PDB file of all heavy atoms in Angstrom:
ATOM      1  N   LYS O 127      19.396  32.604  35.971  1.00 19.92           N
ATOM      2  CA  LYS O 127      20.591  32.034  35.349  1.00 19.92           C
ATOM      3  C   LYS O 127      20.383  31.819  33.852  1.00 19.92           C
ATOM      4  O   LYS O 127      21.299  32.010  33.048  1.00 19.92           O
ATOM      5  CB  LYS O 127      21.007  30.725  36.035  1.00 19.92           C
ATOM      6  CG  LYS O 127      22.408  30.237  35.641  1.00 19.92           C
ATOM      7  CD  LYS O 127      22.747  28.868  36.240  1.00 19.92           C
ATOM      8  CE  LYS O 127      23.367  28.986  37.634  1.00 19.92           C
ATOM      9  NZ  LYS O 127      23.802  27.654  38.149  1.00 19.92           N
ATOM     10  N   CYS O 128      19.169  31.429  33.480  1.00 18.52           N
ATOM     11  CA  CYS O 128      18.828  31.259  32.075  1.00 18.52           C
ATOM     12  C   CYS O 128      19.942  31.801  31.174  1.00 18.52           C
ATOM     13  O   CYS O 128      20.438  32.912  31.379  1.00 18.52           O
ATOM     14  CB  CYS O 128      17.501  31.956  31.782  1.00 18.52           C
ATOM     15  SG  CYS O 128      16.242  31.663  33.052  1.00 18.52           S
ATOM     16  N   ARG O 129      20.327  31.010  30.176  1.00 18.26           N
ATOM     17  CA  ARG O 129      21.459  31.349  29.314  1.00 18.26           C
ATOM     18  C   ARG O 129      21.077  31.806  27.911  1.00 18.26           C
ATOM     19  O   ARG O 129      19.985  32.324  27.678  1.00 18.26           O
ATOM     20  CB  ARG O 129      22.406  30.159  29.192  1.00 18.26           C
ATOM     21  CG  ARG O 129      23.374  30.026  30.333  1.00 18.26           C
ATOM     22  CD  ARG O 129      24.418  28.993  30.000  1.00 18.26           C
ATOM     23  NE  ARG O 129      25.246  28.678  31.156  1.00 18.26           N
ATOM     24  CZ  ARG O 129      26.050  27.624  31.225  1.00 18.26           C
ATOM     25  NH1 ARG O 129      26.131  26.783  30.200  1.00 18.26           N
ATOM     26  NH2 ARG O 129      26.771  27.408  32.318  1.00 18.26           N
ATOM     27  N   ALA O 130      22.001  31.596  26.979  1.00 19.37           N
ATOM     28  CA  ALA O 130      21.829  32.001  25.589  1.00 19.37           C
ATOM     29  C   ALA O 130      23.123  32.611  25.058  1.00 19.37           C
ATOM     30  O   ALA O 130      23.687  33.521  25.668  1.00 19.37           O
ATOM     31  CB  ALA O 130      20.678  32.983  25.457  1.00 19.37           C
ATOM     32  N   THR O 131      23.591  32.103  23.921  1.00 17.89           N
ATOM     33  CA  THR O 131      24.853  32.550  23.339  1.00 17.89           C
ATOM     34  C   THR O 131      24.630  33.569  22.233  1.00 17.89           C
ATOM     35  O   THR O 131      23.867  33.330  21.298  1.00 17.89           O
ATOM     36  CB  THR O 131      25.651  31.380  22.736  1.00 17.89           C
ATOM     37  OG1 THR O 131      25.358  31.269  21.336  1.00 17.89           O
ATOM     38  CG2 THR O 131      25.311  30.076  23.443  1.00 17.89           C
ATOM     39  N   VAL O 132      25.309  34.704  22.339  1.00 18.14           N
ATOM     40  CA  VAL O 132      25.218  35.730  21.317  1.00 18.14           C
ATOM     41  C   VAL O 132      25.726  35.199  19.987  1.00 18.14           C
ATOM     42  O   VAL O 132      25.607  34.007  19.691  1.00 18.14           O
ATOM     43  CB  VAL O 132      26.022  36.979  21.697  1.00 18.14           C
ATOM     44  CG1 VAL O 132      25.530  37.533  23.020  1.00 18.14           C
ATOM     45  CG2 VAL O 132      27.503  36.647  21.774  1.00 18.14           C
ATOM     46  N   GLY O 133      26.308  36.087  19.189  1.00 16.38           N
ATOM     47  CA  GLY O 133      26.683  35.745  17.826  1.00 16.38           C
ATOM     48  C   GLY O 133      25.438  35.765  16.963  1.00 16.38           C
ATOM     49  O   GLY O 133      24.320  35.818  17.480  1.00 16.38           O
ATOM     50  N   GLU O 134      25.623  35.725  15.646  1.00 18.44           N
ATOM     51  CA  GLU O 134      24.496  35.752  14.714  1.00 18.44           C
ATOM     52  C   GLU O 134      23.784  34.403  14.677  1.00 18.44           C
ATOM     53  O   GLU O 134      23.602  33.742  15.707  1.00 18.44           O
ATOM     54  CB  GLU O 134      24.969  36.114  13.296  1.00 18.44           C
ATOM     55  CG  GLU O 134      25.998  37.239  13.223  1.00 18.44           C
ATOM     56  CD  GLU O 134      27.436  36.745  13.345  1.00 18.44           C
ATOM     57  OE1 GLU O 134      27.757  35.679  12.775  1.00 18.44           O
ATOM     58  OE2 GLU O 134      28.248  37.431  14.004  1.00 18.44           O
ATOM     59  N   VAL O 135      23.372  34.009  13.478  1.00 15.89           N
ATOM     60  CA  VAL O 135      22.897  32.661  13.241  1.00 15.89           C
ATOM     61  C   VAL O 135      23.924  31.951  12.364  1.00 15.89           C
ATOM     62  O   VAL O 135      24.973  31.500  12.850  1.00 15.89           O
ATOM     63  CB  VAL O 135      21.529  32.665  12.547  1.00 15.89           C
ATOM     64  CG1 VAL O 135      20.447  33.098  13.524  1.00 15.89           C
ATOM     65  CG2 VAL O 135      21.562  33.584  11.333  1.00 15.89           C
ATOM     66  N   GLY O 136      23.623  31.868  11.068  1.00 20.54           N
ATOM     67  CA  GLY O 136      24.545  31.273  10.115  1.00 20.54           C
ATOM     68  C   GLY O 136      23.829  31.187   8.790  1.00 20.54           C
ATOM     69  O   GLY O 136      24.413  31.422   7.732  1.00 20.54           O
ATOM     70  N   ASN O 137      22.545  30.860   8.865  1.00 26.93           N
ATOM     71  CA  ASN O 137      21.705  30.790   7.685  1.00 26.93           C
ATOM     72  C   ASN O 137      21.930  31.992   6.786  1.00 26.93           C
ATOM     73  O   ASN O 137      21.483  33.100   7.085  1.00 26.93           O
ATOM     74  CB  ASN O 137      20.226  30.686   8.073  1.00 26.93           C
ATOM     75  CG  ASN O 137      19.713  31.936   8.757  1.00 26.93           C
ATOM     76  OD1 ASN O 137      20.429  32.931   8.881  1.00 26.93           O
ATOM     77  ND2 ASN O 137      18.462  31.890   9.207  1.00 26.93           N
TER      78      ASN O 137
END
Side-chain angles (χ1 to χ4, degrees):
Chain O
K127 193 185 272 185
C128 316
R129 277 190 189 166
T131 94
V132 302
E134 318 88 39
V135 287
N137 66 4

